[PDB]
Swiss-Prot record, chain A:
Keywords: Calcium, Cell membrane, Disulfide bond, Glycoprotein, Ion channel, Ion transport, Ligand-gated ion channel, Magnesium, Membrane, Metal-binding, Postsynaptic cell membrane, Receptor, Signal, Synapse, Transmembrane, Transmembrane helix, Transport, Zinc. This is Glutamate receptor ionotropic, NMDA 1. Belongs to the glutamate-gated ion channel (TC 1.A.10.1) family. NR1/GRIN1 subfamily. Disulfide bonds join C57-C282. The chain holds residues 23 to 384 of 903 of the full protein. It comes from the Eukaryota. Residues 1-358 are extracellular. Glycans are attached at Q39, N177, N250, N274, Q324, N342.
Swiss-Prot record, chain B:
Changing H275A: Normal zinc binding. The keyword Cell wall biogenesis/degradation does not apply. Phosphorylated on tyrosine residues. Residues 1-358 are extracellular. Zn(2+) binds at H91, E248. The gene is Grin2b. Disulfide bonds join C50-C285. GO terms for cellular component: apical dendrite; cell surface; cytoplasm; cytoskeleton; dendritic branch; dendritic spine; endoplasmic reticulum membrane; glutamatergic synapse. The chain holds residues 32 to 394 of 1482 of the full protein. Belongs to the glutamate-gated ion channel (TC 1.A.10.1) family. NR2B/GRIN2B subfamily. This is Glutamate receptor ionotropic, NMDA 2B. Component of N-methyl-D-aspartate (NMDA) receptors (NMDARs) that function as heterotetrameric, ligand-gated cation channels with high calcium permeability and voltage-dependent block by Mg(2+). Participates in synaptic plasticity for learning and memory formation by contributing to the long-term depression (LTD) of hippocampus membrane currents. Channel activation requires binding of the neurotransmitter L-glutamate to the GluN2 subunit, glycine or D-serine binding to the GluN1 subunit, plus membrane depolarization to eliminate channel inhibition by Mg(2+). Expressed in the hippocampus including the dentate gyrus (at protein level). Detected in adult olfactory bulb, brain cortex, hippocampus, striatum, thalamus, superior colliculus, with much lower levels in inferior colliculus, midbrain and cerebellum.
Length: 358, 358
């Protein structure tokens, strides 16, 4: 009889619950499991936040889970109640598909890693493109919300590390008449424009930019994934370059890698001395899990090179490093892949890029 | 006049009779029910408030506890925002300053803002010409608002402030690498402002002592929530610790439960006597995904502008009391918290002109 250590998961469907079970069973097969052996405990998202928080207590923490994998559901329901409730006890949470930058804020999310990068990390790819295509002067338009400013912060860090940002412009999320803002951009000499915005906000930008004839030849538009999704795509100027996170939405893939990482980390934890159990249930328990913060360190330092979504490491915020992106280019109104960022290197493929105009 | 239901929730031994006996000409009258509660984990607090809200019609909650648990405040904000129900944290963990409440919380706390305590702490230092200091915080929410307030104050001052060092301590990870010790070693200043939780402070002081920063020549100043319950004094707290404090000398629990009920009742009367309706108490927590568009934080305008019985019980939009009388306290040679100043009408009235020792 070994010791049974539960991993927890909050996942979108019961197909994914079953994938998580099979992942944990594989880890037990793969590892030496005489001393410790993992057990999968899981659940699908509840219809609202308060119910979800309760479920984490009743269904997961009641089984003394050492960690909790969480996906982004199909339908306003975030990982946030799971992060809070698990965080109360310093039980680590692994985000599988959540990409909002807010989850990188340690104050709000103590014990939160994720196997996909935040949107703001798309700046890494922008920067490498700017070196590659020698865009040494860029304008940067961003939404004045957390996410928009996160992208600005991140790009500026890379520039104040050479290419430069000639100006940075921010607009109120929800604005449609962005002619005022874009005229300000039109008047600068730089004709490379980088955009961080939500779907609907990018649409507003794209329209206004078209009226002002800033989508034609001369101009380069360089955006991320949100800004060429759904309704943004539907008005985006031809020639635009944007990004898609490869496997960014494969819950199954990230369950596979998350479990591998967590399994590794568990076995690495139990090499060390004086490991305590997490609290059994929520009721009556108000102290942190003494070992939580150690386990968080172990996870953070976890390297898993041979992963399905590539090379798994985490940065100082617990965000995924070495993520891989499709570099997409709108050509005759079709999104066409012109290369990939492979984790560190831009690899152009044989499909020629077509810029706005050309 | 019609009745609104107000739940008063008391965690920990309480003179329920002193409270009832201690407590309305308006357009609406309170029907107050005392619930008692023994536990302050998330599940216990959530289910208890949800059960109340479904086994009765609750216009608002008044919450008091006897713990040092700042998490209770977090939990209450979440609950308040999800159910759009007014919750007043009037004592204990419930009252320990939560920074960055939800956009749509109706959660208000008895006690001083982070910014107000920062300015009180600089006033203390000015009185004794303590112009040279460092700051130490953890990542506990508010820590930026704290540091910014200081920085903002002293960069706008004709006074010769010298902020030598600001340390940010990561206690979401374990301290096996003696990292936090190495950060603390870097402190030279004779005054040290510490922003963190009580439980965090406990550990920081232990380390600080080990590297000789608790003795004579070093003075630490901490905010209310570190001192917390002053009848409970961790052994690692250094004698000569100074704290700001709103823990219930001159403003006793009975008088607060009184005002809590007054604030909620008045607020509702004011809204009814202008709009001819008040928000219908939520049938449950478990149908809040449905009743979204039917609910509002409308009642907030009124909650934050109640004058009752000659006192301005206004809140800030940030959700804290506007004009609290604060006591400055000192941890003395008998390990007892002692009153050494008042802060009243933006004037600081200290006891000593020169600080005694031993
Ligand atoms: C994303 O794409 C990048 C770039 O392609 C990959 O990084 C490269 O990985 C390859 C391995 O596939 C590395 O190739 C090795 O290079 C060694 C020398 O590297 C030096 O010189 C290069 C070129 O000037 C520099 O870029 C580098 O910084 C070093 O200064 C060779 O010695 C290796 O040869 C070995 O293997 C061969 C078999 O092919 C044997 O015959 C040899 O005996 C020897 O053992 C090898 O060729 C390359 O160095 C990496 N480049 C960089 C920049 O790091 C990433 O792997 C890829 N990422 C993902 C996730 O796919
Ligand atoms: C800020 C959010 C809103 N808050 C939500 C918490 C919450 C909410 C609802 C429920 Cl239901 C529950 Cl259960 C919990 C997170 C939590 O307050 C993180 O607090 C910390 C952060 C840092 C520190 N210092 S550090 C990083 O050095 O260790 C300490 C404590
Ligand atoms: C998702 O990843 C799994 C591997 O874990 C793979 O079998 C499947 O084909 C992937 N789906 C897509 C759409 O790539
Ligand atoms: C944990 O450390 C304590 C203190 O020495 C000791 O009593 C106990 O046996 C240890 N447990 C393990 C599992 O090492
Ligand atoms: C709390 O404990 C008291 C006894 O100290 C008991 O009478 C009461 O029923 C308990 N309340 C709850 C909610 O369990
Ligand atoms: C509301 O605030 C106003 C300040 O604009 C002030 O008249 C008073 O404090 C409040 N009015 C009331 C309580 O009727
Ligand atoms: Cl439970
Ligand atoms: Cl190409
Ligand atoms: Cl209880
Ligand atoms: Cl919330
Ligand atoms: Cl406080
Ligand atoms: Cl505490
Ligand atoms: Na994180």
């Amino acid at each position: 009889d070994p010791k049974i250590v539960n991993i927890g998961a909050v996942l979108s469907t019961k197909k994914h619950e079953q994938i998580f079970r099979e992942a944990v069973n594989q880890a037990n097969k793969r590892h030496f499991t005489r001393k410790i052996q993992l057990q999968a405990t899981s659940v699908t998202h509840r219809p609202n936040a308060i119910q979800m928080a309760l479920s984490v207590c009743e269904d997961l923490i009641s089984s003394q889970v050492y960690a909790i994998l969480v996906s982004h559901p199909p339908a306003h329901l975030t990982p946030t109640p799971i992060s809070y409730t698990a965080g109360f006890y310093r039980i680590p949470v692994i985000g599988l598909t959540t990409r909002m930058s807010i989850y990188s804020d340690k104050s709000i999310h103590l014990s939160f890693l994720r196997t996909v990068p935040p949107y703001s990390h798309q700046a890494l790819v922008w920067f490498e493109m700017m070196r590659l295509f020698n865009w040494n002067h860029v304008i940067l338009i961003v939404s004045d919300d957390h996410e928009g400013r996160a992208a600005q912060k991140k790009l500026e860090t890379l520039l104040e590390g050479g290419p430069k940002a000639d100006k940075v412009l921010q607009f109120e999320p929800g604005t449609k008449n962005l002619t005022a803002l874009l005229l300000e951009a039109k008047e600068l000499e730089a004709r490379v424009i980088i955009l961080s915005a939500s779907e609907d906000d990018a649409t507003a930008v794209y329209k206004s930019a078209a009226m002002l004839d800033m989508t034609g030849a001369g101009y380069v538009w360089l955006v991320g994934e949100r800004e060429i999704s759904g309704s943004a795509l539907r008005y985006a100027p031809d020639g635009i370059i944007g990004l898609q996170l490869i496997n960014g939405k494969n819950e199954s893939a990230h369950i596979s890698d998350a479990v591998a990482v967590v399994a590794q980390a568990i076995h690495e934890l139990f090499e060390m001395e004086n490991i305590t159990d997490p609290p059994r249930g929520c009721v009556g328990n108000t102290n942190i899990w003494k070992t939580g913060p150690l386990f968080k360190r172990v996870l953070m330092s976890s390297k898993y090179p041979d992963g399905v979504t590539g090379r798994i490491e985490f940065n100082e915020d617990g965000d995924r490093k070495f993520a891989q992106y499709s570099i997409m280019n709108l050509q005759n109104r079709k999104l066409v892949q012109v290369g990939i960022f492979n984790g560190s290197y831009i690899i152009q493929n044989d499909r020629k890029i077509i810029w706005p105009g050309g | 006049p019609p009745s609104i239901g107000i739940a008063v929730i008391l965690v920990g031994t309480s003179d329920e009779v002193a409270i009832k006996d201690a407590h309305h000409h308006l357009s609406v009258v309170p029907r107050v029910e005392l619930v008692a509660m023994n536990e302050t984990d998330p599940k216990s607090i959530i289910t208890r408030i949800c059960d109340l809200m479904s086994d009765r019609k609750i216009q608002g909650v008044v919450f008091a506890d006897d713990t040092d648990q700042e998490a209770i405040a977090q939990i209450l904000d979440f609950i308040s925002a999800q159910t759009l129900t007014p919750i007043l944290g009037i004592h204990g963990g419930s009252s320990m300053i939560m920074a960055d409440k939800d956009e749509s919380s109706m959660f208000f706390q008895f006690g001083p803002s982070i910014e107000q305590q920062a300015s009180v702490m600089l006033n203390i230092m000015e009185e004794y010409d303590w112009y040279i200091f460092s700051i130490v915080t953890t990542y506990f929410p508010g820590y930026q608002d704290f540091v910014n307030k200081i920085r903002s104050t002293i960069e706008n001052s004709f006074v010769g402030w010298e902020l030598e060092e600001v340390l940010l301590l990561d206690m979401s990870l374990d301290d096996g690498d003696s990292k936090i010790q190495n950060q603390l070693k870097k402190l030279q200043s004779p005054i040290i402002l510490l922003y963190c939780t009580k439980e965090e402070a406990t550990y920081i002081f232990e380390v600080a002592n080990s590297v000789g920063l608790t003795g004579y020549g070093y003075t630490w100043i901490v905010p209310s929530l570190v001192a917390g319950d002053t009848d409970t004094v961790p052994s690692e707290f250094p004698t000569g610790l100074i704290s700001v404090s709103y823990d219930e000398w001159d403003y006793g629990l009975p008088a607060r439960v009184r005002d809590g009920i007054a604030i909620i009742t008045t607020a509702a009367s004011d809204m009814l006597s202008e709009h001819s309706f008040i928000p219908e108490p939520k049938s449950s927590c478990y149908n809040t995904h449905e009743k979204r568009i039917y609910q509002s934080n409308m009642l907030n305008r009124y909650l934050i502008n109640v004058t009752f019985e000659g006192r301005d019980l206004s809140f800030s939009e940030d959700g804290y009391q506007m004009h609290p009388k604060l006591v400055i306290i000192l941890l003395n040679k008998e390990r007892k918290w002692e009153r050494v100043g008042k802060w009243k009408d933006k004037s600081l009235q200290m006891k000593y002109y020169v600080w005694p020792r031993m």
